[PDB]
């Protein structure tokens, strides 16, 4: 558990409907919703591939006895009860911890992207605390997608940042 | 008395090889077989015993 999902970020986005995870920005040209492609792509892939594999690891009629082998039905109906119930216990393990994987998985996920956010903004930002930073520069369309890419300039904002902060 | 009947029939079967024969002899109380069956075998069948309809 990373504590992001119902965490910090307390509630998910109905208006985000072009991925799992993503980002939503309020500059002076407008606000707006928008998915972080890679992440869910790669999420996608990774849990596509999870699917499969639980899938791929699985992959008669009863026989008929007189009244003078029921020594011989009792050990078929042994057989058979035995084998029922490990694949049952199986099959309810596996679907119980995939589950739990699952959940962390996109929890570190959301995580994961708030930290990549984080360590590129350093001090021109300020952390709400609600999943949000508050931008010491005024910065357009151009600097939320370089944030987004992940080609954000310091440098570029540092003195103009540091007046208003 | 079952079936109004005192006496009994014993019912035996069994399987013969390609070349191989069979041999009956008797002095009475023989049912003699009339149709025999060749038999082809796959697997992949069964016996089921179901109430249900077949469409």
Known sequence: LFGAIAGFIEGGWTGMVDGWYGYHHQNEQGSGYAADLKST?????????????????????????NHLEKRIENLNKKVDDGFLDIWTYNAELLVLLENERTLDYHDSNVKNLYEKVRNQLKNNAKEIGNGCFEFYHKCDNTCMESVKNGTYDYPKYSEEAKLNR | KVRDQEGRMNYYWTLVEPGDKITFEATGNLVVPRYAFTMERDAGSGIIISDTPVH
């Not at chain 1, 792509?41 to 006895?65: H, L, P, R």
Request: charged letters at 30%; proline letters at 0%; aromatic letters at 4%.
């Open chain 1, 41 to 65: 792509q790669n999420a996608i892939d990774k849990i596509t591939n999870k699917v499969n594999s639980v899938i791929e690891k699985m992959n008669a009629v009863g026989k008929e006895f």
